[PDB]
Design a protein around this ligand. Structure first.
Ligand SMILES: O=c1ccn([C@@H]2O[C@H](COP(=O)(O)OP(=O)(O)O)[C@@H](O)[C@H]2O)c(=O)[nH]1
Ligand SMILES: [Ca+2]
Length: 267
């Protein structure tokens, strides 16, 4: 497929949002699309519905199986285990033939042709992430990456949000980036999937994507929603507003797509 996207949904609401994310992709491209899912994180309900969604929305899909390695420190907390599956296994989840994959959070709405991201030149970096927004000024106290350890550590590199990233799997494998990330994970990560790649940039470069690639209201100004290519419903450490409430109000298409999926289910 032209576009290859990987995501995870563990939890009822994340599954509901993942179906919507997938629909949002298909509304904005006429390229071929394949979704990749990790077997362990597929529930019976989701697995049952998935082929219907595929026959309606015109995507293909494949499951990968990868057991957390015995020698690799585990995560007792499910949420952190999931975040680990996002980042620790990029060289081993997928077939060797797969050239490139894009990770998109389940709680996203896409508003762009994701082939644009497939075509985007990473300029030798094995993966690309969007910088955190600076624009919403009221949230400065929560921008921990501008404080203490991170300002010094980053040496002028951005701190990037891990909701969306494109991985040149060939370059990533050639650089042995997976072994390096797993080695650093052992050595050291409150934000496991985000702190790790941002910490390792000198060793494993990030291509900083243009800012429009990922908008989250937590960090980003209202005025920049209109030019956002994708939207993430990232948790807001100030308001603690429930994600479902945010999904209903943020952009009109979330409810549009949820309703469309509901009508598919009636059939
Ligand atoms: O209980 C969870 C927590 C996280 N995730 C997956 O991990 C991603 C990142 O976590 P989340 O979106 O909750 O983080 P935020 O963007 O809110 O900081 C989610 O979109 C899901 O794909 C999940 O499936 N179940
Ligand atoms: Ca998210």
């Amino acid at each position: 497929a032209d576009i290859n996207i990987f995501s995870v949904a563990s939890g009822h609401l994340y599954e509901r949002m993942l179906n919507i994310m997938m629909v949002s992709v298909m509304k904005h491209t006429k390229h071929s699309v394949k979704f990749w899912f990790i077997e362990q994180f597929l529930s019976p309900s989701f697995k049952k519905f998935l082929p219907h969604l595929a026959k309606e929305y015109g995507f293909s899909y494949e499951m990968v199986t990868y057991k957390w390695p015995h020698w690799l420190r585990g995560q007792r907390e499910k949420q952190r285990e999931i975040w680990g599956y996002k980042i620790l296994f990029l060289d081993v989840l997928f077939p060797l033939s797969l050239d490139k994959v894009i990770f998109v959070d389940a709680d996203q709405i896409v508003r762009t042709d994701m082939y644009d991201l497939v075509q985007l030149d990473l300029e030798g970096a094995p993966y690309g992430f969007t910088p955190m927004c600076d624009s919403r000024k009221e949230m400065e106290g929560f921008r921990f990456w501008k404080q203490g350890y991170w300002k010094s550590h980053l040496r002028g590199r951005p701190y990037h949000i891990s909701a969306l990233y494109v991985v040149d799997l060939n370059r990533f494998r050639a650089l042995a980036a997976g072994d390096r990330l797993r080695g650093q994970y052992h050595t050291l990560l409150a934000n496991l999937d985000q702190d790790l790649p941002n910490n390792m940039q000198a060793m494993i470069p990030i291509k900083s994507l243009p800012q429009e690639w990922l908008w989250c209201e937590t960090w980003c100004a209202d005025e920049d929603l209109k030019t956002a290519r994708t939207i993430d419903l990232c948790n807001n450490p100030l308001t603690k507003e429930p994600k479902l409430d945010r999904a209903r109000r943020q952009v009109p298409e979330w409810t549009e797509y949820d309703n469309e999926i509901a009508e598919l289910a009636v059939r």
